[PDB]
Amino acid sequence: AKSKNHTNHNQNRKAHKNGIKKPKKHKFMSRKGLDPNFFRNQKYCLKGIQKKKKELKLKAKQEKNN
Amino acid sequence: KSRGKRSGTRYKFSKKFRKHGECTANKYLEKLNYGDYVDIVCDSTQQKGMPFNYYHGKTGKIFHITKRGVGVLVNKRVKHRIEQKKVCVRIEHVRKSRCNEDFLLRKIKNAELIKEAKLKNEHINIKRKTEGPKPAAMIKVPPSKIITIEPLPFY
Amino acid sequence: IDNSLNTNIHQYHIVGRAIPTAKDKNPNVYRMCIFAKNDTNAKSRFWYFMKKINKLKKSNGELLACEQIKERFPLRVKNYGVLLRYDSRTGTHNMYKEFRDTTKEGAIAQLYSEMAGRHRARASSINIIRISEISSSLVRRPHIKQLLKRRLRFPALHLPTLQKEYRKKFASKRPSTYRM
Amino acid sequence: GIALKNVGRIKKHGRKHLVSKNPYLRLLVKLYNFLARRTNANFNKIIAKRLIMPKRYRPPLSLSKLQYHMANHPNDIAVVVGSITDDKRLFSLKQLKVCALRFTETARKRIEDAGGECLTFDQLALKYPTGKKCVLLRGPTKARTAEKHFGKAPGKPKSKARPYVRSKGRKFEKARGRRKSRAYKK
Amino acid sequence: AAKKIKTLKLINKKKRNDLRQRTLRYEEEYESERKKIIELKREARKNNCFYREAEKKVVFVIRLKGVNKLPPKVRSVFRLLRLLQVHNGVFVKVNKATKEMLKIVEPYVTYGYPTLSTVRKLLYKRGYVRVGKVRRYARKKIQDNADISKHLGKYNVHGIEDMVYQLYTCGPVFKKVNNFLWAFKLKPPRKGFKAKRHAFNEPRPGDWGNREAHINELINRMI
Amino acid sequence: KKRLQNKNSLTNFAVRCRLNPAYKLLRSLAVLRMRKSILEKSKNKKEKRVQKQIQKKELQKINHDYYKGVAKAVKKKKKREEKKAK
Amino acid sequence: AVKKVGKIIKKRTKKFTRFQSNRFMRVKPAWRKPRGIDCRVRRRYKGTNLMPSIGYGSNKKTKFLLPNNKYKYVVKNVKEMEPLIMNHTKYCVQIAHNVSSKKRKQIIERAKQMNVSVINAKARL
RNA sequence: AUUUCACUCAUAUUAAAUAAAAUAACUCCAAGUGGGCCAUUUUUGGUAAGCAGAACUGGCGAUGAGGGAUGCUCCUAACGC
RNA sequence: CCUAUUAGCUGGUUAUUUUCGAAAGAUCUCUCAGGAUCGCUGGAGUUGAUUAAUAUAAUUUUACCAGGUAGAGAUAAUGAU
RNA sequence: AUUUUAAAAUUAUUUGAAUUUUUCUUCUUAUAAUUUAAGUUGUUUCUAUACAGUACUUUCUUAACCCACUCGUCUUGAAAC
C-alpha cells in the first residue's frame, strides 16, 4: 500500500539525546599526503637534530661512566 | 531526484550587482599560513577549486597549503555529531578570516597594559566587561526642550 | 478604606529620553501622563507610546522620572472631558466622552467600564488622549448636564443591599421594595 | 516534576564490587579498601581500584618490560596488579624488587636467582603502607587479540581491524573489497 | 594536648567579632545609601533637573510554568538559570548576557527587584546551601555559619549577613554566593496568581514578565 | 551529623543571634528607640513639619508647571485641529 | 489506610488482589502485574485495583516484628531454642506445623522456663 | 618548519556571562524499532475533506492526575506511600 | 511414508519487586506486510572528574562572517500590462 | 560510649568599656545554672483493680458518599457495531 515517503520528525531530538558530538581535535595530524618535498625535508631536519642530540648524550654518558 | 554538485546555487553562486569579473590582482598577494583561520567564499568567476555548496560562508583552519590551493578543516553537522571535513579549494575562493582579529588586538593591548601594570605593581582586571546596568546620572536639562507627548488621534 | 470599592487605576507622570549618542549629544526629553494599574504598567505604556510616536525604543532609551500624581482634592466632585481613540472590530474611531467624579483615575476607570460595556472595547484597544477637567458651562453630554441643576434631588428606588449576615434565607413576611 | 538529567541521580560507570569469589583476593581487597580510606594515598586508592578490575585489565607484564621500566630506579620496588611472566628474549636479569598478584614459576625462579625478590600485596601493605619508593606499573591492556577486531569495522576505509575468518589463505576474504582488481579495495 | 580546642575556640570568637563588625558596617551602608538617594532626589527636585537612578543590578526570578511542552531553547535557558521546578526562584545578576537569556524565557517566568528585606527573609527562612564535595552537594538548610565559612571563607564571606549583603548589592563575591545557594523552593502564592497565561504588563490581569519592585509582595506571599 | 529540626532562623531568638551576631544589638536599639515617650514627639511634630514649607513650595511649583505644560499641549493640539478644520 | 499501633506503622492493609479475579474463577486473587496493552490497572485508571509499589514498604526499624514487638522464630526442636536463650526479649517462638504433641509439650516447657513467649501455645491440646 | 635554551602572558574570581557542567569521554556485546498519528506556526496538490504530501517544535503513541459535561493529542500538570 | 516439509503471514507465548528505557528517520535491497545497516536503548568495562575548574553547553554576550525568504518595485533589468 | 559538644540565648553574681542614656542598651572578665540551644515533654484520668464481653484487635457480610466500560491482541487509534 501507499507508505509515508519521508520525514525528519524526531530526528533532531534523536540527535540531541546523545548530544551533538564534537570532533576529538587531536594535537597532531598525519602528514601522509601533505606537502611532499617539505615534510621529507622535515624528516631530514628531525634526523639531524636527533643525531646531534644523541651523539652529545653518548659523549656525556661515556665520559661520565669512564 | 536532482542532486548535482551545484544544485540550488542559483543565487549563492552568482556575482553581486555591478560586482562581476575576475578577482583583483591584489587577492593573489594575501598571505596564508598553516593553522590560521580562513573563510570559504566561493568566487563563481573561478571554476576550478570551487568549494561545494555547503561550505560557502564557513570558516576553518588551514591544514594544507599548495602552490595555488589550500586545504581547510571545516566542521560539518551530520545528524547526531559534528565531523571534520578537509575541503580543498583554490586561493580565489578563500579569504583571511577576521573571526579572531578582535582576539589578537585584545592580546597585544592586554599585553602592553599588563606590562606597565606589573611595573607599577597595580592589580588590574583584564577580562572583558560585558557592561550592564548604568550608574545613576544627575542630569541637567533646561525646560525649553521637555516636550509633552500625547497619543495621536486617528485620521 | 473600602478595598471592595477602590479601583486599581492611578495616574503617573513619566519622563524619558533617548540615550545620548555621537549623532546628538542631548536628545529632547519626552514627558507623559499615563493611567495604569501600577508604575511598571505605566512605564510599559510610556515606552510603547515612545516607540509608536517617536522612533525611540526602550532598548535605546532611559527613564528620567516616574512619579504618581495624586489628586489635589480627592473629595471634590468635578466634571472631566476625556478624548479617546479606540479601534473596533472593523475600524478605528476617536470619540469624546464625559464623566464626573472626584479623581481623574476614577473617571478613567468609569471610562474603561463604559467602553467595555457599550462597545466591547478591551483596554488593549483603548488609547487615552487628553483627559481634562471641564467647567459646568462647557459640559456637552446631557446625562451630565442633568447632574448640574441648582438643587438636585431624587428618590432612592434602589433595592436594599444588606450584609451577608442579615441576608437570611427564610423570611417571616414578604419585604417591601417601597421602604422609603 | 523537575527537569533534571537522569531524573537527578548521579550515574557512575565501571566496577563497583569484586566479582571474583576468591577468599584471598577478597581479603586483599578489604585490606586495600581500608588502606585507601584511612590514608590519603592515591597509591592505595589506585591499587584498590585495580584489584577489582577484570582479567583483561590486569594483563601480564613480562620480565623484560619490568626491568626496562625499573631501569632508572634501581632502589625502588615495582608494583604490578597483574602477573609477571618470564621473557626468554631477555638474556640477563638484575636485582628486581617486585610486588605482584602472581608470578609464573619461571619468572619467580629467575628473579630469585638474580637476587631480587617477589612480594605479595599483603607484604607490600605491611612494608610500604603509603607506597614510598613504589612504582605502579601495568602491562599492555590493549595488546590482546580481541582488541585487534575492535574499532572501525573491517571494511571501513583505512580500517586496521582484523576480520573474523575461519582461515587466512588466498581464498578467504581476499578478493572483492580488499584489492583494486575486484571492485574496490578496503 | 588540649591546645587545639583552645585555639579553635579563639579562632571562632575572632570570626564572630569580625562578622559582627562587618554586619554593623553593612547596616550603616544600607542606611547611608537610602538617605543619599532621598536627599539626591530632593536636590534634583529643588533644581530644574531629572535624577535617574541606577538599575538594581540584581533580579529575582520565579519560574511559573511546569516542565512539559517547552521549546529546547527555553529548557536550556532554564537549566542555565537553575530554574527546574514550577515554583523555583533564583537570583540573577543583571547584564547584557543574562538579560538576553531572560528575554527568551520571559513568558514562563516573573522577576523583579528583591529589596533588602525580602532578600533577608528569603535567605533566613528559605535559604538552603550546597554543602558537600564538588558535584556532590547535598542541600542543607543554613542553621549555622559553619558551612558558609567553610566554603566561602576564602572570599571572607563567613556569615548569612555577608551573603545577604553580597546578594542585595551585587558585590564582588556574587557568583560564588549565588552558586553556593541552592535554588529557592517557593510555596504557591497565598492569595493566588492573576493569570500565568498573560503578561504583568498587559492591561488584563497577568503575571509573567518583569514585575520590577512588585516582585516583593509576590515573594512575600510565596515564602 | 544527624539531621534535627530546622529551627526558624527568624523567630527563634537563640539561633537568630547565632546566625547574626549583630542582631541582638540591632534589635535592642530598635526596641529602645521605640520606647521613646510620646511627649517629645507631641511637642516636636510642629517644629519638624514647619521646616518643610520650602519643600512644599517647590513641590507645588513642579506639579503646577507640569500641569501647565499639559494644558499648553492640549491648547496647541486644539488650535491645530481648528486650523485643520478650515 | 495506615494503621498505627505504638511504634508500628502498617502503611496499608487489605492486601492487593489480582485484577479481574473478582469475576473470574480461573483467575486467582494472588497478585500478578497486569502486562496487557490497554489494561486500565496497568495504566493506573482511577478507581480500579491499584498496584503494589515500593512506596508501601514498612519502616525497616519495625519491619518484620509481630504485634508483640518481637520477631518470630519457627522451631521444630527443643535444640533450636539455644539461640533464643540470648534473645528472649526480642524473639517470640512459633512451633512448626508438623511437630507432634510430645515434642510440642517439651518445646512449650523449655520456652516457658526460658521465659520466651510462644505464638501457637495451645495447639493440639 | 622543527628542536634546545632564555624572559613572561589575569589565575589571590578564574584571558566575556551563566551553568544539580565529569550524570563526562571512550570501548565492547546486544535488544526492540524501521506501518505512525496529532496540535501551533509555515507550506504543496485539491472545490474541499476527520483528504493526500512536506518543514520546526511540542505532544499522543508509551501516560496516568485536575479541568474542558463527554473525548488517545486542548489547558494546568506529568505519577513511591 | 518422505514429514514435526516450507511459511517475509495469523494466533499464542506461564512468578514478584526495583532500576534504565525506545523507534515508527535514513541507506541499500526482485524492495514496499520483509531484511541488512545507521540512528535511538540497555548491560558491561576502562579512562577521567571528584580540586564550585577544566573538559563541556539545543543559552546568551563581544568580534567577525555568509544568505536573497518575508517585504518592496514595476520609471532598475527580464517577462507581463 | 569520647561534638545534644562547642558556642547562642536567658537568669543570678562579677570585671572593664562603650553608648543610641538604660527595669529586654550593647560589647567581655570570670563563676554557677537554665533553654529560647542540642527534632515533646509533664500531669490527671480511663482501659482497670479483666483474663475475652456489649469493650479492644482482626476477618467477613452488608450498606452509604465519591469513583469505576471487557480482558487478551493487531493497531496511530479498542469499551467498541
Nearest-CA distance from B104 to chain A in Å?
Answer: 22
- Taking CA atoms, G98 is separated from G26, G82, G104, G118, in Å, by 31, 21, 10, 16
Beta pairing partners, C78:
C101
CB of G100 closer than 8 Å to CB of G76? no
Question: Could you tell me if E61 and E89 are in contact, meaning their C-beta atoms sit under 8 angstroms apart?
Answer: yes
Phi, psi of B132 (to 5 degrees): -120, -110
Question: In this complex, do C94 and B146 lie within 8 Å of one another by their Cβ atoms?
Answer: no
F15/E143 Cα distance (integer angstroms): 7
Give the 3-state secondary structure of residue F13. Answer: helix
Closest by CA to E123, choosing from E95, E170, E80, E90, is E90
Three cell numbers, residue D32: 586495600
Residue A56 CA neighbour count, 13 Å, CB half = 6
Kindly state the cell numbers that stand for D167: 582461515
Residue G31, classified by CB atoms within 10 Å of its CB into exposed (0-12), middle (13-18) or buried (19+), is middle
Residue of D42, D20, D43 whose CA lies nearest to D99: D43
Question: Which residue among C15, C93, C130 sits closest to B150, beta carbon to beta carbon?
Answer: C130
Q: Which cell is B27 given?
A: 587577492
C-alpha cell at B46: 573561478
Cell of residue G125, nine digits: 491440646
How are beta strands E184-185 and E128-129 bridged, if at all? Answer: unpaired
| Closest Cα in chain B to C84 | B153
Q: Is the dihedral of CA E57, E60, E64, E65 positive or negative?
A: positive
The Cα D61–Cα D59 span in angstroms is: 7
Question: What backbone torsions phi and psi does residue B62 show, to the nearest 5 degrees?
Answer: -75, 130
Q: How far apart are CA A10 and CA G109, in angstroms?
A: 74
Contact G2, G10 (CB under 8 A): yes
D145: its cell numbers: 587479540
Yes or no, beta carbons of B143 and F65 under 8 Å apart: yes
d(CA D58, CA D29): 15
In angstroms, how far is CA D7 from the centroid of its own chain? 36
Distances (CA, A) of E48 to C26, E39, F73: 16, 15, 20
Nine-digit cell string for C81: 472631558
What subunits make at least 3 CB pairs under 8 angstroms with C? B, E, F
**Secondary structure (DSSP) of E12-52:** HHHHHHHHHHHHHHHHHHHHHHHHHHHHHHHHHHHTTEEEE
**Measured distance CA(B43)–CA(B20) in Å, rounded:** 10
Give me the F residues in range 27-66 that sit within 7 A (CB) of strand J. 27-29, 31-33, 35
- Contact by Cβ (8 Å): B153, C83: yes
Best CA proximity match to D15, nearest among D57, D53, D61: D53
Angle of helix D42-50 relative to helix D23-38, nearest 10 degrees, comes to 160
- List the one residue out of C13, C15, C19 whose CA is nearest residue C61: C19
Question: Residue E95's beta-bridge partner residues?
Answer: none
Q: State the cell numbers at D175.
A: 578478493
What sign does the CA torsion over E21, E27, E29, E31 have?
negative
Q: How far is the CA of A18 from the C1' of H24 (A)?
A: 12
Which strand J nucleotides have any atom less than 7 A from protein CB atoms?
A: 4, 6-10, 20-28, 35-40, 57-60, 66-68, 70-75, 78-79
Cite the beta strand spans of chain B per DSSP E: 37-40, 58-65, 69-78, 81-90, 94-96, 137-140, 147-148
Q: Is the dihedral of CA E196, E197, E202, E203 positive or negative?
A: negative
**Under DSSP, is residue G101 helix (H, G, I), strand (E, B) or coil?**
helix
The string of DSSP letters for G2-36 reads -EEETTEEES--S----TTGGG-TTS-SS------
In chain D the first and final C-alpha atoms are separated, in Å, by 52
Could you tell me the end-to-end alpha-carbon distance of chain B, in angstroms, rounded to an integer? 55
CA distance to B34, E1, E12, per residue, from E5 (Å): 64, 9, 10
User: Which secondary-structure segment (H or E) carries B107?
Assistant: helix B101-119
Give the C-alpha separation, C81 to E110, whole Å.
37
Count of C-beta atoms within a 10 Å radius of residue C56: 19
- Angle of helix E160-168 versus helix E3-46 axis, rounded to 10: 30
End-to-end CA distance of chain A: 91
Residue D101 — φ and ψ, nearest 5°?
A: -65, -60
Do chains D and F touch by CB distance (3+ pairs < 8 Å)?
no
Q: How far apart are CA C143 and CA C140, in angstroms?
A: 9
Distances in whole angstroms, Cα of residue E13 to Cα of each of E1, E16, E19, F28:
21, 5, 10, 22
* Chain B contact for F30 (CB, 8 A cutoff): no
The cell 566542521 sits on which residue?
B75
Give D103-110 contacts, CB < 8 A, sequence gap 24+: D107/D63, D108/D84, D110/D63, D110/D86
CA–CA distance, C70 with C87 (Å, rounded to integer): 30
CA distance E136 to E153: 19
Contact residues, chain B, for A14 at CB < 8 Å: 79-80
Partner-chain contact F73 B150, CB within 8 Å: yes
> What is the enclosing helix (H) or strand (E) of E177?
helix E175-180
Residue C69's CB is within 10 A of a number of other CB atoms, namely 17
Residue E201 neighbours by CB under 8 Å, 6+ apart: C40, C41, C44, E209, E210
Q: Which of B83, B81, A17 has the alpha carbon at shortest distance from E72? A: A17
Collapsing DSSP to helix, strand or coil, E195 comes out as coil
Which run of H or of E encompasses G111? helix G101-113
Residue E208 is classified by DSSP as B
Separation between Cα atoms, residue G66 and residue F20, nearest integer Å? 50
Contacts of B134 in chain E (CB under 8 A): 54-55
Q: How far is B150 from chain F (nearest CA, A)?
A: 8
What's the CA gap between E98 and E104, in Å, rounded?
Answer: 10
E95 close to E61: Cβ distance less than 8 angstroms = no
**How many whole angstroms separate alpha carbon C169 and alpha carbon B146?**
62
HEC profile of C107-143:
HHHHHHHHHHHHHCCCHHHEEEEEEEEECHHHCCCHH
Distance of alpha carbon G29 from alpha carbon G39, whole angstroms: 17
Instruction: For residue E221, give the amino acid letter.
Output: R
F70 touches chain C (CB under 8 A): yes
Q: Are E90 and E184 in contact (CB under 8 A)?
A: yes
Residue C66 bridge partners (DSSP)? C14
Cα–Cα nearest to B88, from B40, B136, B123: B40
Cα-Cα-Cα-Cα dihedral sign, residues D40, D41, D46, D47: negative
The residue whose grid cell reads 602528514 is: A31
B32, B91 Cβ separation under 8 angstroms:
yes
Size of the C and F interface in Cβ pairs below 8 Å: 10
| Distance of alpha carbon E201 from alpha carbon E207, whole angstroms | 8
**Contact call for residues C112 and C88 (beta carbons, < 8 A):** no
Q: Cβ distance D135 to D70 under 8 Å?
A: yes
Burial class (CB in 10 A: 0-12, 13-18, 19+), G99: middle
> Which residues does D159 contact at the CB level (< 8 Å), separation at least 6?
D151, D152, D153, D186
Q: Test F22 with E23 for CB contact under 8 angstroms.
A: yes
* Residues in CB range of C17: below 8 A, 6 or more apart: C27, C28, C29, C30, C61, C62, C64
Q: Is E111:E211 a contact under the CB 8 Å cutoff?
A: yes
SS (H, E, C) chain D: CCCCHHHHCCCCCCCCCCCCCCHHHHHHHHHHHHHHHHCCCHHHHHHHHHCCCCHHHCCCEEHHHHHHHCCCCCCCEEEEEEEEECCCCCCCCCCCEEEEEEECHHHHHHHHHHCCEEECHHHHHHHCCCCCCEEEECCCCCCCHHHHHCCCCECECCCCCCCCCCCCCCCCCCCCEECCCCCCEC
Residue carrying the nine cell digits 486644539: F78
Specify whether the CB–CB gap between D39 and D130 falls below 8 A.
Answer: yes
Look at residues G95, G50, G51, G67 and name the one whose alpha carbon lies nearest to residue G10: G67
Grid coordinates in use for B48? 576550478
The answer to whether F74 contacts C13, with C-beta atoms less than 8 Å apart, is: no
Residues 6+ apart with CB under 8 A from D172: D165, D166
Q: Quick one: cell of E84?
A: 527546574
How far apart CA D111 and CA A31 sit, in angstroms, is 45
CA E113, CA E210: separation in Å to the nearest integer?
9
Return d(Cα D160, Cα E50) in angstroms, integer: 77
Single-letter amino acid code for the residue at E35: K
Burial class (CB in 10 A: 0-12, 13-18, 19+), D157: exposed
- Are C148 and C136 in contact by the 8 Å Cβ rule? The answer is yes
> Side by side, which strands form the sheet with C126-134?
C92-101, C78-87, C126-134
Task: Dig out the grid coordinates for B53 from the structure.
Answer: 555548496
C-alpha cell at E117: 528585606
Q: Are D93 and D109 in contact (CB under 8 A)?
A: no
Å resolution of this model? Answer: 2.3
Is the minimum distance from the CB of B44 to strand I below 7 Å?
Answer: no
Query: Which residues of C touch chain E, with CB atoms under 8 Å apart?
Result: 15, 29, 36-41, 43-44, 62-65, 122-124
Distance of CA E142 to the CA centre of its chain: 15
Greatest extent of chain F over all pairs of C-alpha atoms, in Å: 89
Beta bridge partners of residue B116, listed in sequence order: none
**E40/B131 Cβ within 8 A:** no
SS3 C75: coil
DSSP string, E70-112: --HHHHHHHHHHT--STTEEEEEE-SHHHHHHHHTTGGGEEEE
* Rounded-to-integer distance, Cα E69 and Cα E67, Å: 7
- Strand J contacts (CB < 7 A) among E residues 128-167? 143
Across all strands, nucleotide nearest B95 (CA–C1'): I65
Using what technique was this structure determined?
cryo-EM
Name the DSSP class of B15. Answer: P
Which residues contact residue C71 at a Cβ distance below 8 angstroms, ignoring those fewer than 6 apart? C102, C103, C104, C105
User: Distance between CA E166 and CA E163 in Å, rounded?
Assistant: 5
Backbone conformation region of residue E32, classed left if phi is above 0, alpha if psi is from -120 to 50, else beta: alpha
Residues 4-63 of G with CB under 7 A from strand I: 31-33, 51-55
Tell me the Ramachandran region of residue B47: left when phi exceeds 0, alpha when psi lies from -120 to 50, beta otherwise: alpha
Would you say D59 and D25 are in contact if contact means Cβ atoms under 8 Å apart? no
Whether E42 contacts F56, CB under 8 Å: no
Q: Which of these, B99, D70, F19, lies nearest to E162 by C-alpha position? A: F19
- Print the SS3 string covering F27-40: HHHHHHHHCCCHHH
CA B68/CA C35 separation, integer angstroms: 70
Beta-bridge partner residues of C98: C81
Kindly state whether C134 is in contact with chain F, defined as any CB-CB distance less than 8 angstroms: no
CA of A61 to C1' of H66 (A): 86
Round to whole Å and give the CA distance between E4 and E150.
Answer: 18
Please name every residue paired with C82 in a beta bridge, in sequence order, or none if there are none: C97, C131
State the Cα–Cα distance between residues C74 and C105, nearest whole angstrom: 10
Query: Residue G108 CA to J55 C1' — how many Å?
Result: 31
Q: Which stretches of chain E sit within 8 Å of chain C by CB? A: 50-52, 200-204, 210-214
- Alpha-carbon span D78 to D34, nearest angstrom: 22
Q: Between A14, A29, A35, which is nearest B80 by CB?
A: A14
Say if CB C50 and CB C57 are below 8 A apart. yes
**For residue G85, what is its C-alpha cell?**
536463650
